[PDB]
Amino acid sequence: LKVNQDGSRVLLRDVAKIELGGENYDIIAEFNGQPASGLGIKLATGANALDTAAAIRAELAKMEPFFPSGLKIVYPYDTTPFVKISIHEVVKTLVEAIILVFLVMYLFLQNFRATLIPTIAVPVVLLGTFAVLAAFGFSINTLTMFGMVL
Amino acid sequence: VDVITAIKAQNAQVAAGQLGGTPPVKGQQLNASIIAQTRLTSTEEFGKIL
Amino acid sequence: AVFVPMAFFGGSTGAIYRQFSITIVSAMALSVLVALILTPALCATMLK
Amino acid sequence: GMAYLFVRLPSSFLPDEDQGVFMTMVQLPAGATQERTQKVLNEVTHYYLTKEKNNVESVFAVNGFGFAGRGQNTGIAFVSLKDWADRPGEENKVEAITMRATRAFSQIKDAMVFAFNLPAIVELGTATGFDFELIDQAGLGHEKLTQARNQLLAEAAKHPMLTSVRPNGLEDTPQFKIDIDQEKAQALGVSINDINTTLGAAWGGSYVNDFIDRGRVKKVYVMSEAKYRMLPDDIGDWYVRAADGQMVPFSAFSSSRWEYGSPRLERYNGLPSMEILGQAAPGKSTGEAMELMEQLASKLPTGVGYDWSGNQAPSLYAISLIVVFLCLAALYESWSIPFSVMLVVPLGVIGALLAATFRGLTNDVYFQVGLLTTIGLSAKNAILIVEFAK
Amino acid sequence: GAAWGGSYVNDFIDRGRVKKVYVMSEAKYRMLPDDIGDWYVRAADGQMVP
Amino acid sequence: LPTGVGYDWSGNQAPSLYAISLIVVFLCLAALYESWSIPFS
Amino acid sequence: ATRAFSQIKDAMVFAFNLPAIVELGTATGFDFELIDQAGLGHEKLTQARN
Amino acid sequence: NAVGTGVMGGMVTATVLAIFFVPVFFVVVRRRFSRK
Amino acid sequence: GADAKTVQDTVTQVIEQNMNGIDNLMYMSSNSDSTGTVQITLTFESGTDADIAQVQVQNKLQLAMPLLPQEVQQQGVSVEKSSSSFLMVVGVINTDGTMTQEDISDYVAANMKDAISRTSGVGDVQLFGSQYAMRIWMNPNELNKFQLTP
Amino acid sequence: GADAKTVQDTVTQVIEQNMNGIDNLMYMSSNSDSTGTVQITLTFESGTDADIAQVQVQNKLQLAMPLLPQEVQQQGVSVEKSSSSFLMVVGVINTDGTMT
């Protein structure tokens, strides 16, 4: 900074303290009362959601291994498993709605061979709606999946 | 060039920080933003530039 | 005649009431077609 | 009856549900600190980790970041509940979790903390709810506009068949105004450039340059130890050099005095606005409340304007009444069959209404389509009763 | 340039909307070629020059 | 190699592609030749 | 041509059919890359590739 | 629950009403014949 | 540093005037904070491309770019896809080789954040804590006793 | 003038940090030369529009634009469509009225 008359060297250490500190101390996170910092990924107006968050782990899969001692990952507020579950609860109702039809179908049609035609009718009609809404742009949305069931 | 420089100095808005700064000191109770220079408003205020 | 007329969606209720009729409207034509090609065939082929 | 089972049935959009994941934000009084707010995020984390072990898998507190905006006033804690099996009861479910949670934060605290199901819907469209905004159209200022919204929010609460209305987040905290006497400065012999980048590079921060750190280039910043910029008395510590090679205090050329500004100034559509998040009455519903709010903003001073199932069905179904009759004579040409099937419409629909009016269900989106499907089978059934017997 | 042509010096606030500050000269002192002599600029040696 | 040193880089194509060539054949080979004798000729 | 440049010269010159194909996909061929993930530098990385 | 509670209600009340008791028979009677 | 009134009419207003001549649009908005952080939001017609709609707003902002404070120009100007709603919020803590809520915030933002934001159409990444920066703490009395300024 | 280490972390690194939030992408790369010439390359998913894909990379580069040396700003910054492969390479010589 300076050199006063008697060649006494003034440095930046003398007039000010120098540590490697944060760029912004305005915000501070505590995972269950323990000091930490994470990542809050926000969606891109028209992004694929579940497919984007699958690739959040894909890119992050190769960062994991080169971490230093102690540095662990942990998952709060996560959308992923709710997608996983609504699919599993609807496809559950699908198979239930088949089996249950199959019993009313036997109760009336004592013929087992006849309790088979309608049983083996809607399996194909569902698949077609996957092939039709894929051909029209739609997804396996929360909506279209209740439309499979309904 | 002096008139121009007088407006590029007096007629301006300056980024002054705040009390209870971004990294404050443990125990402070207040946090208020500092005001500094202001962009001038009226014709009268431009008449009084030194 | 009740689904696709109401499938004429609106605004933030867009893909809402849209995907609602269509999905099953798609399923209705596929249900009719299957009931015009397969359910016929299968039933004739082998019922009793 | 059918009609009465339908007109009285309330109209939602989509059912908000347990997601195994919710959150809750904080908001301190005017001009709170990082140390004061962090006390509250310790208390909120304690309701969850000691009084909710059964339900809460892991929280994730954050001091200084509200979903309004940011600041040492704001806060937010991200909850992450345990899986759904281990969490069985209705009390274990998010409806009940954000109930006694909200009740405890309005009980043993002195600030403002809530808690809510993450609207599984979109941010917009709550149904029986609002989004008003108060524009200043004329040449009025932020201060006159504030009084106009105080008169709008007052008139609604003065005479609400009610309403529930509150501001968004312009708390209106004071600011430490520093007036620099210009003539005084130049007499002591100082450049006003040097005076500005003293106050800016001491109290605020200044992006000076970049340096390299372990490969990645980061930033060099310059400010001051905290203790020399915490109160208004610490302004005198900073002495700036004058042309005549000698120091000069702030107090010499400075003026110290507080003022009433606001810490956030919203601007809707090129003009200054202050937004008002009200809701429909407990009895009324939007179209009523909304229309009973445009008449209150039109009773405000000059130079102060404003700007904000669905109407959907009315028309949508209108085409359902036309395509039916046409398709009901595309194979059943007569004008006798096109009136048969017509009556199975409310034959089934009456029960659809009744089953959802019996349980807690409402007229949302799934139900509105549960009607359409109910009518499709109603036609089906009937048409066979017809087609065969014809 | 700042006498005959105009010069965008800075911005100021006017009834909310931030507009521009401009600097030039009264018209009569920049209408013909004889008016160039009116403008005297300062020289390093603290005195005017035509 | 040492620590802190990672890496990053017909076709597998045919295996699957042709797999569908083995399915559409049999179906088209009984779309006119219904038997389960011609579909193996 | 390639044989003569590896014969009566002292530097490195080749020669090749312009891959009528794309730049990529030679078949029986590669494209590896050696990343430094941790806080090591260009100099330590050089020894790793050696 | 929002889907089925709406349908179940309408379906119970579609059939057990339609096929029997109220119209879906009483219609064609007074629509095809009544006056024309 | 800039207060709520500064940013409101030296960054905010300067863009709001120079933010026109764009296709598909119903309104705009703004939030000029006291921390010194303005952020505008333009909502378009439903079904409009967010790919093109970005370009237009961010290629007209970039005409009022040199009408701004120079502190602001070198600061972070951004144009991105909003979705007020996170999904994956991956917390990162330490257990063994202990580190502060600042040591982690830096390594998070100097190894991972750069990649994720890019990866699979992520609109914008949010950072908890902050990346490191050569921080200096100027003592005012120490500046005077040698005779100096910041 | 800038050497291989200069351009590598005053132009190169400054963009590499400010080069994110883009649709369709598998990797990026760089070459920071000693002549004083860096050039980045981003390869996208196959079938992706190169019309839109340009815009995105070049409207985010233009946020780290004022984070660069001023010698670099007035120098040639470019964003274009790569195709490492020429086709027409029209040489132009002189015969009569000689020139260098």
Ligand SMILES: CC[n+]1c(-c2ccccc2)c2cc(N)ccc2c2ccc(N)cc21
């Ligand atoms: C809406 C675009 N668009 C049009 C279209 C509509 C109006 C004017 C021009 C084209 C379209 C038109 C016909 N005949 C058949 C299929 C499609 C189609 C199919 C899928 C999709 N994802 C968008 C589609």
